[PDB]
Amino acid sequence: VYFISFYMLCAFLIINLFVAVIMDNFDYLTRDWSILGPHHLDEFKRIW
Amino acid sequence: FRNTILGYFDYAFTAIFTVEILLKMTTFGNYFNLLDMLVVGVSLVSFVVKILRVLRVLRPLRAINRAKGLKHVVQCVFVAIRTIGNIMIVTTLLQFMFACIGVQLFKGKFYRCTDEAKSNPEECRGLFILYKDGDVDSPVVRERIWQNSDFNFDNVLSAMMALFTVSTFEGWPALLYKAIDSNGENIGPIYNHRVEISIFFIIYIIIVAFFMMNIFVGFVIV
Amino acid sequence: SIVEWKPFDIFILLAIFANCVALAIYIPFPEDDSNSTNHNLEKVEYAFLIIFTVETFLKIIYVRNGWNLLDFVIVIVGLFSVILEQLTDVKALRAFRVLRPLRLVSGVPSLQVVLNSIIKAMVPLLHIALLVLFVIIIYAIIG
Amino acid sequence: SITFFRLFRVMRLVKLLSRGEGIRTLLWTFIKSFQALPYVALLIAMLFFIYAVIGMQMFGKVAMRDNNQINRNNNFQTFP
Amino acid sequence: SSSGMIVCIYFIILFICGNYILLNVFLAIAVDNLADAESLNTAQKEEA
Amino acid sequence: KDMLILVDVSGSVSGLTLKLIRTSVSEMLETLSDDDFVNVASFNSNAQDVSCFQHLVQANVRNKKVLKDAVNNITAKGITDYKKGFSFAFEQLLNYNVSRANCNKIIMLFTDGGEERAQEIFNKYNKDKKVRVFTFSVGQHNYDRGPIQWMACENKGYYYEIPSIGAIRINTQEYLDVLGRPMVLAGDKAKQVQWTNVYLD
Amino acid sequence: FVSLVIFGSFFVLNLVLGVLSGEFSKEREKAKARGDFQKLREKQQLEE
Amino acid sequence: CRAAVKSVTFYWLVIVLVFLNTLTISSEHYNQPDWLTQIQDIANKVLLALFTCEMLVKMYSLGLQAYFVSLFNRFDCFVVCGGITETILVELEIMSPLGISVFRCVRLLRIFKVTRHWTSLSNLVASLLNSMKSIASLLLLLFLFIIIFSLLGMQLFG
Numbered sequence A: 001v002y003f004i005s006f007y008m009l010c011a012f013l014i015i016n017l018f019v020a021v022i023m024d025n026f027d028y029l030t031r032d033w034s035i036l037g038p039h040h041l042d043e044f045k046r047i048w
Numbered sequence B: 001f002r003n004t005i006l007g008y009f010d011y012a013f014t015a016i017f018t019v020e021i022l023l024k025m026t027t028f029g030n031y032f033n034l035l036d037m038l039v040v041g042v043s044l045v046s047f048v049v050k051i052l053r054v055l056r057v058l059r060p061l062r063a064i065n066r067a068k069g070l071k072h073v074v075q076c077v078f079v080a081i082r083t084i085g086n087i088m089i090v091t092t093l094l095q096f097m098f099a100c101i102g103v104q105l106f107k108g109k110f111y112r113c114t115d116e117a118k119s120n121p122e123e124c125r126g127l128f129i130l131y132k133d134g135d136v137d138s139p140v141v142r143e144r145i146w147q148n149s150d151f152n153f154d155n156v157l158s159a160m161m162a163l164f165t166v167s168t169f170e171g172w173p174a175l176l177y178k179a180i181d182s183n184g185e186n187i188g189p190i191y192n193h194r195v196e197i198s199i200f201f202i203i204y205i206i207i208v209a210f211f212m213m214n215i216f217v218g219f220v221i222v
Numbered sequence C: 001s002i003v004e005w006k007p008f009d010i011f012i013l014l015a016i017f018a019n020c021v022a023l024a025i026y027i028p029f030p031e032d033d034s035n036s037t038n039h040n041l042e043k044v045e046y047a048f049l050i051i052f053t054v055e056t057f058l059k060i061i062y063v064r065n066g067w068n069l070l071d072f073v074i075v076i077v078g079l080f081s082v083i084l085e086q087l088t089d090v091k092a093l094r095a096f097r098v099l100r101p102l103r104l105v106s107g108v109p110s111l112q113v114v115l116n117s118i119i120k121a122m123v124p125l126l127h128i129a130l131l132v133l134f135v136i137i138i139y140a141i142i143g
Numbered sequence D: 001s002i003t004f005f006r007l008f009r010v011m012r013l014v015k016l017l018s019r020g021e022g023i024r025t026l027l028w029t030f031i032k033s034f035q036a037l038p039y040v041a042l043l044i045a046m047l048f049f050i051y052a053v054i055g056m057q058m059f060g061k062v063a064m065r066d067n068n069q070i071n072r073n074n075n076f077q078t079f080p
Numbered sequence E: 001s002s003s004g005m006i007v008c009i010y011f012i013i014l015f016i017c018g019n020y021i022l023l024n025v026f027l028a029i030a031v032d033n034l035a036d037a038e039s040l041n042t043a044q045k046e047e048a
Numbered sequence F: 001k002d003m004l005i006l007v008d009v010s011g012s013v014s015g016l017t018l019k020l021i022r023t024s025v026s027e028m029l030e031t032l033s034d035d036d037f038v039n040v041a042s043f044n045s046n047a048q049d050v051s052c053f054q055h056l057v058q059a060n061v062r063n064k065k066v067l068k069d070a071v072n073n074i075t076a077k078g079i080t081d082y083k084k085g086f087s088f089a090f091e092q093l094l095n096y097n098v099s100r101a102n103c104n105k106i107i108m109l110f111t112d113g114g115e116e117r118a119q120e121i122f123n124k125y126n127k128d129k130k131v132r133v134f135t136f137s138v139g140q141h142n143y144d145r146g147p148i149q150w151m152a153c154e155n156k157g158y159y160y161e162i163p164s165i166g167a168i169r170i171n172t173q174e175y176l177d178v179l180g181r182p183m184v185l186a187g188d189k190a191k192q193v194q195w196t197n198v199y200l201d
Numbered sequence G: 001f002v003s004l005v006i007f008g009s010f011f012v013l014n015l016v017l018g019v020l021s022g023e024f025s026k027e028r029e030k031a032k033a034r035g036d037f038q039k040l041r042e043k044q045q046l047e048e
Numbered sequence H: 001c002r003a004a005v006k007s008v009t010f011y012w013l014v015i016v017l018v019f020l021n022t023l024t025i026s027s028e029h030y031n032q033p034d035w036l037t038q039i040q041d042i043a044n045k046v047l048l049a050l051f052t053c054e055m056l057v058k059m060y061s062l063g064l065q066a067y068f069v070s071l072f073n074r075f076d077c078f079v080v081c082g083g084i085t086e087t088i089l090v091e092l093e094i095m096s097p098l099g100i101s102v103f104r105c106v107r108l109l110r111i112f113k114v115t116r117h118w119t120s121l122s123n124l125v126a127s128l129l130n131s132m133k134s135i136a137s138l139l140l141l142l143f144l145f146i147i148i149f150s151l152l153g154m155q156l157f158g
């Protein structure tokens, strides 16, 4: 029971690293570089 | 010498805890505070002895209440957990059904003798000559024991344990080749007796990977 | 040249499937050993090679496709391997027959579009693999 | 005493070969995302602490054989 | 020794390219089939 | 007995099952006395003698050392040809130019498995069943043991399985149960006192 | 070795899976009006 | 008339029926006592006799035609008809030690009856059965990939 419970809890706390470390910022998953974003602002600031 | 020193530190910390906990109830006359007297009660009673020593580990568990974001993260975990209220049930049901099927298929067929020359448990008695590393010139006398596999399918609980180990993807080839060699109710194995029995393991692996990738997609990716 | 519209290509697809079955029922024995089935399959593969070498032989009319070049390489390698065993490590060169089932993705448009989609949907995630190789090289040098 | 400086030669590459257009942002945004939520790692730390203490308390006495899974390299006898 | 270690590219391609394909088979069978069961009950909850 | 050991040295026996074949042959020559004549042959698309003898030899201490030394030198390579292996074996039993035992004629086949019954050779070389054929299937494999079982059944022989090293010592001595069958049926005329060679107690 | 399994597979495997499946969800918005999303909503009420 | 099937007591009795059926199957173990086999080999006999009775009740009260409308009803009648074959072959001359094991697995399919009315698992299987046609191409590509590397490995390391 020690090892099985530890494995399940470890796998349950590893899901919190996918729902709170990667899915927290969706502004990059569907970045859509073609139309608009922050890259244009960064390039304009650098040219300025 | 080290163990005695650490015992004196427990006296000091518990004294600090017990002089502060009574202060809290002075301004009262909410629910997580019950764990606060839970730990102090364990320590003084500690002064089965093996249970009080293992139950006193809940020191960092009450640090959640004093922290702001820690309680929010714990509540988010408790909300997250209910998301898979359905899948986590169907996967358990499928594991139980596959455990019962495996019990029917490999009931008692995983036994084997210490020397790979006796098939019946009646022939696996006494001593035998074992040759180390396959060398015929270096024999050693060993006793033969009619042993059973560590992860067998004798009953439903053992089948569930074996299938869980398979679903963790660890040691599953060894179990697969043990089941391929599985002969009969109370006899030893034969090299590649029934290769086709791997369909059971392959199907179980496929439909467990499908589900584990189904409750992980609609949890983090949806 | 004019009859090759639909009955002819289904024949080629079924021949490829039969060749896959024959190549799957071949038992690789250790150190030149064999049985009767392997000899019969070796005799059968002549027919398959004769048909697959005539496919491009009667293919004039197509030359720049990414699949026709693979077909030509398979045909030339098979011929060079068959002519290298009649006059006499030729067994190593026989590993090109496993590329014949790769023709099935070209003969099925539903598979052809899916392969192109899966190969074109992994260009944006290339940077990740670059970082993987970067870290692997750093850790190898550190080791 | 001489290895610490000699090892540091490998890290002179990254400062100049990380300048690719896009990889900088890819690393930078994700390290910001990781640093933005440090409380979730505290749960894993507490889990490991609790389970390690329990393991050393209830399995810590077992000896270290050389053909066993509990050996000089794998044991419950020490917190690390 | 020698060129016996050059046949270890077979197990790398089979692992890297075989695991990749499995993602596109298992992610596409849940992203667009598990999200289809979200709107499925959305219209069933509208009638409830 | 006029023993003659046939060893399969085809490609399929390479690996562990060649180690057991060489050990089973070595532990079987230990059951041959000075009155028994033995020779060892091998076949892989071609049958040849494994040693320098080329005919049945007295199998004394010196001769058995040569055969034992020559057995632990054979390599597995080539295809299997049972007709050529048995034709070569049946020709050495019919030599009669050299000194022999003029007694039990037996052929021992140490192999793994095949699909060739070679029934055209047994109907040509021994129609009267004057030569016993004992067949051994050695190693862990899945090859067809049917023809190997049939070979030992038509020719008054026996079929033996040697999967691992533990079965080598006991399976290489049970062939004397078969060879003692005619002596039992003789009755009182087979009960004659014999004396061994000089040996250390 | 510990840092090689944390920075290595664990982390990066997070990136590969997040980025790959990020486009699957992105394609769903394209799929939302490509010809299946409205069809599935149609064939769930008539069956009931 | 029609209220002997939709009644709450009928469904709550079917739940207990399925629970007993699965308890008789999941109670097997290696070296089980003979009395457990007796009490377990007659339990299916009294359960198959009662399940067949319920099938007869439901067949002649709802109509012979409307029964084979949902996929689950055909599954249930298939399971019930397969149980009859198992009960008679194990008593006739045909022994089938492996055939016995396969038939007892069929009786394990009755547990799906209690999960039938969950309104969520049906959506999962419905979505899969309607979406397998749009990914059979990718699954066949994966299988072709498997076959190609199986043959290549057989050639290289055979």
Ligand SMILES: CC(C)CCC[C@@H](C)[C@H]1CC[C@H]2[C@@H]3CC=C4C[C@@H](OC(=O)CCC(=O)O)CC[C@]4(C)[C@H]3CC[C@]12C
Pocket: B155, B156, B157, H022, H023, H026, H027, H028, H029, H030, H031
């Ligand atoms: C979903 C519901 C129906 C669960 C039903 C519970 C039983 C099917 C489980 C729980 C208790 C399990 C039993 C737990 C304890 C044991 C004893 C065990 O045998 C022995 O104790 C001695 C073994 C020997 O004599 O060699 C066999 C498995 C068995 C009966 C298990 C068989 C399966 C049982 C009966």
Ligand SMILES: *[C@@H]1O[C@H](CO)[C@@H](O[C@@H]2O[C@H](CO)[C@@H](O)[C@H](O)[C@H]2NC(C)=O)[C@H](O)[C@H]1NC(C)=O
Pocket: F095, F097
């Ligand atoms: C010895 O064996 C040979 C063959 O195994 C027998 O055959 C004769 O061999 C001798 C020459 O060695 C020649 O006479 C002929 O070539 C063979 N045939 C005949 C009919 O003689 C031979 O008969 C055996 N016996 C002797 C005394 O040689």
Ligand SMILES: [Ca+2]
Pocket: C033, F010, F011, F012, F013, F079, F080, F113, F114
């Ligand atoms: Ca052979």
